[PDB]
Design a binder for these strands. Structure first.
Length: 43
DNA sequence: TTTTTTTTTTTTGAGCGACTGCACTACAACGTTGTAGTGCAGTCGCTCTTTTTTTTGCTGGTGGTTTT
C-alpha cells in the first residue's frame, strides 16, 4: 500500500468483477488502467 | 364515365480537456486530529483551412431551312 494508492481499489476490483459477464461488448473498463505494472510501480 | 376539396411548423454538435467542489484515506503533529494527495462528478471553453487540372471534326466533301 502506497501513499498515492488509495484503499478504494477493492471497489475497482468489484467493478471489474461485474465486467466479466459476456463477450458481446467491445469497450473495457477504465479501472483496468489501475492494474498496469507501469502505473502501479510509479505509484 | 362523372368528379371534391386543403394552407399550419418542427430539427439540428460532441469529443478533448480544464475548473471547482466534495469525499476519502495516509501520515505526521499534538488516542485523536489537521494537512496533503487522489478519485469522481458537475460545469464549462473550444473548435472544426487552403483548389485546379479539357479532345469534341465552322461547310469531313452525292453536303444546302421555310413555300406552295
Amino acid at each position: 500500500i502506497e501513499s498515492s494508492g488509495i484503499d478504494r481499489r477493492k471497489f475497482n476490483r468489484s467493478n471489474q468483477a461485474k465486467w466479466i459477464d459476456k463477450i458481446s461488448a467491445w469497450a473495457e473498463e477504465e479501472t483496468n488502467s489501475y492494474q498496469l505494472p507501469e502505473s502501479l510501480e510509479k505509484f
